[PDB]
A paper describes a structure:
The final gene in most type 1 BREX systems, termed ‘BrxL’, encodes a large protein (670–700 residues in various species), with much of its sequence predicted to adopt a fold corresponding to the chambered ATP-dependent AAA+ protein family, which are involved in a wide variety of cellular functions throughout all biological kingdoms. In this study we have demonstrated that the BrxL phage restriction factor is a multimeric DNA binding protein that displays ATP-dependent assembly on double stranded DNA.
To study the structure of full-length BrxL we next purified two constructs, wild-type BrxL (BrxLWT) and a variant containing a catalytic point mutation in the ATPase ‘Walker B’ catalytic motif (BrxLE280Q). A subsequent CryoEM structure determination of full-sized particles produced electron density maps extending to ∼3 Å resolution that correspond to dodecameric particles comprising two six-fold symmetric (hexameric) protein rings, again associated with one another in an antiparallel tail-to-tail arrangement. In addition to the difference in protein copy number and symmetry between the unbound versus DNA-bound BrxL protein assemblages (corresponding to two heptamers versus two hexamers), the BrxLE280Q density maps also demonstrated the unambiguous presence of double stranded DNA spanning the length of the BrxL chamber, which would seem likely to represent DNA from the bacterial expression host that was bound by BrxL during expression and/or cell lysis and then carried through the purification process. The density of the DNA was not of sufficient resolution to directly determine a specific sequence of the bound DNA moiety, and so the modeled identity of bases in the refined model represents an arbitrary sequence based on the best fit to density at each position. Approximately 6 full turns of DNA (62 basepairs) were visible and modeled into the density. The dimensions of the BrxL (E280Q) dodecamer are ∼195 Å in the longest dimension and 140 Å across the exterior diameter of the cylinder. The diameter of the interior chamber is narrowest (∼30 Å) at each end of the protein assemblage, where positively charged loop regions from the NTD and AAA+ ATPase domains of each subunit are in closest contact with the DNA, and considerably wider (∼80 Å) near the chamber's equator, where the C-terminal domain of each subunit makes contacts with the same domain in the opposing protein hexameric ring. Multiple contacts to the DNA backbone, at each end of the bound duplex, are contributed by basic residues extending from loops contributed by the NTD and the AAA+ domains.
Residue numbers in the entry:
A (entry chain I): 195 to 486, 491 to 677
B (entry chain C): 583 to 677
C (entry chain J): 195 to 291
The structure:
């Protein structure tokens, strides 16, 4: 492609390979946003006779898809890569453009005029970023620079990959090699020939996808893995570690899109904890996003941290987030590791909250608001079962609209009748809370019997709070 | 006579212009070098704090060894803070 | 061009050569701003049959680059120098222009 690999890090090389992926996998939608000058448009414009760089993004549906009057297939029937440069300015005279593209990317075949025709063009969306990535993450979602008419969850859900164009360094003449390399025509013919094969099923030999991946996530990760496998191993002889590397990269890039979909679409896309399970040793690996435990100060109201022994008995810290909208008292749950025990714990907690609303809220009606509660694990320890009491705490914190105090982890569990339960392994719970950064702990009164079991240096760091009934637990945790 | 640490917290609050946390009673004392002393009559002092309306208490870390001597019902009434050195006592007091 | 070299400074002569430079390099972009009446637009209009002076600047994208309706290339495929006069008001109705 004309670059000097010696001056680029290995992750940068992998991003450059992900740039080549659209050529080698049929119908591979991908979007790449990055700072100017990172050489995004070079490959699609100069180094391939089977790609077209549609300048300005301003195309017409008859031009791109099907000219009914001339009965001629659009761009997608001619080019294997269609790259929309400077995506930020795209606006369609034909509002069908977004719908037709959604159908094409979701299915690969589109119906126009009198026929349903299939085309294998892979669509790439190249965009320029003006602001810092961290500001874009904190104040908005990463897909902000795309046009407003194109910011749809159903639209972005098709994207088989988002590329982190910021991690590739700004291009410099030092990055251009002077050594021998493959002929660009040879390379492009190689890509076009490799389009005919399939490597998406190589993962099933060694790995299995996690439970957080729905059907479209499976499709995206399979396609990206197949593209990378074709680029790196055309011969077909490869080991388990290579498949692991490719699968890690694919899950990471798809996970980025999944985070953006979460931020833009709310309840639908909380299942973002992408992970994969080895087939041999059955152990599970999690993949995060590089560009993105308990910070100081009061977090947003309805957001708390609880600690509890997992299914494996080890202490783990979970963060519970509640979103409150005007509704009919509906309860929505997510991130519960599809565990029925935690689901029922939260159900009993909300039942108590409805039954005891006036005592805590001072007049607020629970039935007039709908609540969505989500669970995010901070220490990959495992699923939590006991969640009634922290869920009630989050409910009251969100409903009253005042934040949970800084660095409190809420402990103990509650029953339907208002009784509290002692915390098992309180020493390890405090150890983890101090490790996680928690400074203040709220404990049930019945737990105080095990205060002597806590070593001195660990117990010194906590402004311990003791409550008698769940209402007192709520008031003490809230402040 | 045991007034060194409360005097230090007083100076810190007055100079920095920060109000101390409401309903917090500072216990223990310090030497000139900053060595913290254990709270004498910790249980009785806590009972007096409960009688006067204290909701928060600040204690030396070394005094934690006398926590098992504290009654359970008395101890559950406070948000108990354990500092390490007088400067940490200041930080606990001023929040 | 019709200019008297003896009545012009060497620097001004080199600027005049830079005026001809667009005619001699393929795909050569250049911008010149000057006071009214300095003879900027004379050469691009009168001194060559291989240049065009697109007056006003409000020329459409289909006229300039490509018109899909007729599938015939715009100006840039025909003339070796395209000079936009009065760059202050040049504007495109289409945003992609």
């Amino acid at each position: 492609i004309g670059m000097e690999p010696a001056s680029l890090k290995e992750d940068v090389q992998w991003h450059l390979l992900a740039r080549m992926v659209p050529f080698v996998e049929n119908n591979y939608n991908v979007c790449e946003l990055g700072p100017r000058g990172t050489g995004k448009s070079h490959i699609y414009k100069e180094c391939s006779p089977n790609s077209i760089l549609v300048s300005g993004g301003q195309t017409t549906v008859a031009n791109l898809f099907y000219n009914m009057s001339s009965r001629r297939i659009g761009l997608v029937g001619l080019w294997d890569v269609v790259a929309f440069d400077q995506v930020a300015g795209i606006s369609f005279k034909d509002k069908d453009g977004v719908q037709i593209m959604k159908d094409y990317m979701a299915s690969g075949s589109f119906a126009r005029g009198r026929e349903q025709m299939e085309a294998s063009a892979s669509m790439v969306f190249v965009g320029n970023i003006n602001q810092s990535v961290e500001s874009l993450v904190k104040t908005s979602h990463l897909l902000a620079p795309f046009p407003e008419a194109m910011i749809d969850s159903a639209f972005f859900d098709r994207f088989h990959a988002y590329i982190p164009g910021w991690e590739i360094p700004k291009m410099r003449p030092e990055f251009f090699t002077n050594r021998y390399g493959l002929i660009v025509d040879y390379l492009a013919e190689f890509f076009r020939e490799m389009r005919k094969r399939s490597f998406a099923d190589s993962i099933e030999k060694y790995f299995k996808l996690g439970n957080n991946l729905n059907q479209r996530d499976v499709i995206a990760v399979r396609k990206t893995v197949s593209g990378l496998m074709k680029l790196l191993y055309p011969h077909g002889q490869f080991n388990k570690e290579d498949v692991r590397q490719c699968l890690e990269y694919a899950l990471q890039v798809r996970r980025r899109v999944k985070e953006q979909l979460k931020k833009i679409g709310g309840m639908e896309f909380y299942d973002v904890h992408f992970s994969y399970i080895d087939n041999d040793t059955l152990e599970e690996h999690f993949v995060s996003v590089k560009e993105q435990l308990i910070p100081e100060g009061p977090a947003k109201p309805g957001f708390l941290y609880t600690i509890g022994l997992s299914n494996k008995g080890m202490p783990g810290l979970y963060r519970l987030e509640l979103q409150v909208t005007k509704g009919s008292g509906k309860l929505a749950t997510s991130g519960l590791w599809n565990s029925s025990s935690a689901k029922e714990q939260v159900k009993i907690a909300f039942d108590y909250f409805k039954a005891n609303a006036s005592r805590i809220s001072g007049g607020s009606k629970v039935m007039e608001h709908d609540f969505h509660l989500h669970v995010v694990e901070l220490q990959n320890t495992g699923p939590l079962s006991h969640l009634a009491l922290p869920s009630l705490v989050a409910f009251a914190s969100g409903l009253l609209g005042r934040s949970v105090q800084s660095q409190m982890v809420v402990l103990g569990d509650m029953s339907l009748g208002g009784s509290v339960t002692p915390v098992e392994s309180i020493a390890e719970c405090l150890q983890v809370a101090f490790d996680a950064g928690a400074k203040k702990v709220a404990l049930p009164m019945s737990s105080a019997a095990d205060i002597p079991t806590i070593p001195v240096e660990l117990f010194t760091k906590f402004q311990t709070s003791f409550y008698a009934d769940p209402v007192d637990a709520v008031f003490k945790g809230l402040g």
